[PDB]
Ligand binder design. Sequence first.
Ligand SMILES: [Mg+2]
Ligand SMILES: [Mg+2]
Lengths: 143, 75, 68, 189, 64, 57, 144, 145
Amino acid sequence: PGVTVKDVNQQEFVRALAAFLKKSGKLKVPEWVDTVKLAKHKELAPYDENWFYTRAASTARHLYLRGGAGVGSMTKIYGGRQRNGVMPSHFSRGSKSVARRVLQALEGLKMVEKDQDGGRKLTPQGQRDLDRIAGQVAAANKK
Amino acid sequence: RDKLNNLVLFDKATYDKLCKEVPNYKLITPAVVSERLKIRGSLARAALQELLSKGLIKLVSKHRAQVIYTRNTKG
Amino acid sequence: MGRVRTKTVKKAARVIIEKYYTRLGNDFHTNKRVCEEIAIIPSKKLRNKIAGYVTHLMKRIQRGPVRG
Amino acid sequence: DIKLFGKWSTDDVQINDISLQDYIAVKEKYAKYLPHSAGRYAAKRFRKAQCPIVERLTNSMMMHGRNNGKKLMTVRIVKHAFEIIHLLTGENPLQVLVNAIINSGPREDSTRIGRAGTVRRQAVDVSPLRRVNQAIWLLCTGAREAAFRNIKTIAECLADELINAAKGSSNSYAIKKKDELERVAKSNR
Amino acid sequence: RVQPIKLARVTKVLGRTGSQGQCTQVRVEFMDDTSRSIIRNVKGPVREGDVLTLLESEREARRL
Amino acid sequence: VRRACYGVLRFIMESGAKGCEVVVSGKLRGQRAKSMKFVDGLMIHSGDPVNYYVDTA
Amino acid sequence: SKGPLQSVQVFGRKKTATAVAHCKRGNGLIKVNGRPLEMIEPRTLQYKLLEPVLLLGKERFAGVDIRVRVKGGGHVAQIYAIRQSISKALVAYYQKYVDEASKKEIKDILIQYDRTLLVADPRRCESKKFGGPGARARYQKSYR
Amino acid sequence: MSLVIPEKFQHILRVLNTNIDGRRKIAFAITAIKGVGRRYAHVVLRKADIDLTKRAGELTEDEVERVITIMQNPRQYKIPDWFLNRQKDVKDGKYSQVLANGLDNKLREDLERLKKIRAHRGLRHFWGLRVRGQHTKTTGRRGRT
RNA sequence: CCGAUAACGAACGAGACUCUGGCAUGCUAACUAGUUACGCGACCCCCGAGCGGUCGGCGUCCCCCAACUUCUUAGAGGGACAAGUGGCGUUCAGCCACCCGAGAUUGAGCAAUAACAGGUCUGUGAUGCCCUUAGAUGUCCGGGGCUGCACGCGCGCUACACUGACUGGCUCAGCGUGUGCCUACCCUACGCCGGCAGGCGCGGGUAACCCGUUGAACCCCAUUCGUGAUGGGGAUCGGGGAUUGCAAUUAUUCCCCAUGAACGAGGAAUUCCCAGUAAGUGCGGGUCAUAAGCUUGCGUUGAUUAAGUCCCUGCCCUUUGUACACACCGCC
Ligand SMILES: [Mg+2]
Ligand SMILES: [Mg+2]
């Protein structure tokens, strides 16, 4: 019955773990979450109020796939498409502060720890929790 | 062909029509029901999943760009 | 189409056959090894083209009186 | 057996006239699971005939800037359209598509460089390959014209176009242009 | 009174026509009567052996 | 100029080569510029081998 | 019991995307990049990945474990590299571990449906020249 | 629930000095007011604690004035100072935000300030030319012919 | 090219040639590239699986303390030649189809004689002649402008939408570059502050070692909008904050909040293109203190049509007429 997050859909997994963080009220949510945009290239605010939980889930899943990635790596991953107005579109990264605060809050629940080199990785506690959540979403997908 | 001024919220004169004939034909899609009932289309999408919740209309697709429903099996 | 040879490969092929007829047959892969020691051919793309026209001529020389 | 999109086998379809059996590729030999194959069919003349007609329609359904490489969106569009025509008719989508092709192919056209009377001066019958090509192109253009500015989606526009062409209604854009071309060719025989 | 739509099968390909190559001229034979055969011109790519429809009985035949 | 070019070409061919070509351009004789080419022997112009076959000055 | 040294690593390349299929003796299992074959990004083109196992049945895959790594190309090129890797690794496995009579009667099934499963596509790209914005398209010129 | 339209549903709403459309969603209906932008709407509604999924006309009468005063007094509801328009005011230095014909007459106030000081930008505005230094060689001909 | 042949013997160009792409489980090799296996772990799974699954987590050139080169890199070589079969052909040169093959036409560079009053004396300490040379056309500095706008044209970028926009998730590339003789000026990891452009402190990298497994865009999946010049469009313009420099006003650029204008697929005409091609989406480089709506090499997604023609526009060869030879934009 071994369940791994890589063995199921990641897009459903991020919803499943965002639900976990929503019901588990331990996230250190800053006061400006209702105002800022997730990226410089993004014109409009997010629609879902639990977007901070969604970002935390997504970066936890990314750190499962590979560790050692810093805030610059996070914003490089979360970059998108800037339409540049009338100029031809280009690629731009997301807000550094949002990813920095998400990562900082991920130390609060003690599942992400900084590394001996640059960046941060998952604790064994986090490695337990990710697949623990993956088990139930796999069960739901099967049934 | 100037404007369509569709319905964003149901009046009773549309909802009574919705109750009886919408779950009575095969190809029921948001665009088709919007053009038949002169409704906005976002309202059509909302009412379509409400009829799904009522359970007398089956889904087939559930796609981000093309959601498709159908009536129940008869005969 | 577009596979017509030039006198550069045609002149060499005629000469080597009538100098070394006893050492040639109707196998291109055999002849392309034959042409290696009997002629210092600067190009790989040329030695096989030289050998290919030889086999075309070797088929005809075993049948009738070719001009060579 | 092939179960294109997991269903709609090609075993039960037929072509009513032998004039198109040589080119339409709904046979079991030309049966494919999924209409996406980089077959290099443009590398030689008459190689698109053995190409499956579904793949041909998928390739031809993208036009006008917005859609020139969005093959995945085109495949999902064709999948939804076939599911929709199956819902609306109750029979195999492939037979509906083949019948639409046959009833959409214009049996004649007209063309001249000399001083034409109205449009073209001499009428000439088309090849069956041109028949199939013009049928697919007319279907794609008709769906796009129907869906240029309206709430209906590409899959449903393709669905109604295929159904109208398969039954014969003089309302589909493809059969309308077919009748117009035949009438002009008849006038300028 | 109306002539029915019929089918004819290509025997051999002659060449292009129309001062641009926009139409190819080929000889065809009736599947209804094998001995019956004419020569026509067709637009679009045609190889030998395929069968093509014919709404009209006889239109044109010229020696280039 | 014409005597000197002939002497130079004679010297080059006497030194031993498959061919040589000399081009002199400028205000020869009158005001109108005219170019004189003295070419002899084998002389290729195209392809890779020209780089290590000809010497250009 | 624990008979070792029955494994191959066969590559498959398509449009700069190369995929190596680590075929290993064991239970019937298929995975790419540590992910299951169905649990994969292109839900639209999942049928192309399912195509080899569809045409050959899980019975031929019973003693087959496949681990595929891809480190190049795009998305659909990645798909085609993966499926070609699966097919090529399987035919190599049947070639060098069992009779090539079986290898031939499994080769012909692939070749009679899709020859791209055994032969890579020679086309990669074409160089863009300095005359226009594309490889062959030229900048729009005007005379007046 | 896709319920019927409420009896007390207003197809248009009079706010400030203009009108909006109740037939559309609230977060884009309130953007019809001059000076009220899309992001400004999407932040003031979140800070004014309403539901986005509802339309405009079924906002209650007290909710309308609550949104009105929330937008009109942004400083005292934790709206960031950098989200406004007349920040670091040219006249009185206050970090204020104006969302009405007050914005229009304030813009005209700044325009006549530039004209009175006869600065380069003021002269360009008065003549109707460009002010940001963009080229006038081949553009801006619609305003003349 | 074969053939004839008052020609013979030749040469240039084309070709031949060089670079790249396409097969090489053949060889040489690889801790500045990896792959398998083993041993530790870390987690899931434990009912019990236990060679169960994942790990871009740690080690096995930490010198005896694993092998191997398929995947990666680049050298040596091979391989393709109409080679084979059938058909057409003076059975000659050659052409078509097909098997087997990775490939049966990959793209470029190079590119003859002769000429243009084609462009550059604003590339040169290439240069004749003429001009100036102290109130200078030398040379430096301050400032302005080269952007200036009733108007016309050319190359482009964004658009007119629903095959869409926006929001969130998922997720894959290759060219080529990075700290300085003068010459000052690099590419950036990580951590903290801020929403942002940015700021601060610590590193790595003169480089397959660090940026960088280049976590790119498009595309894919879910949410909302719903045919409304509308959540398409972002032009003009107000205000605020940073960065570059001695200097940003005539806005260098970038960020944010403000208004949302014309534009609903555009005449007469006209450009380019046959497969990885067009087209969409890009990435680098160039100019760069700051800079890309330009250009250049490379990637990604990826077509419809066609294997013909002289109809228009031109070109090649022969014959032909000429009152043209500044050569029909001729002459008269
Ligand atoms: Mg709005
Ligand atoms: Mg050459």
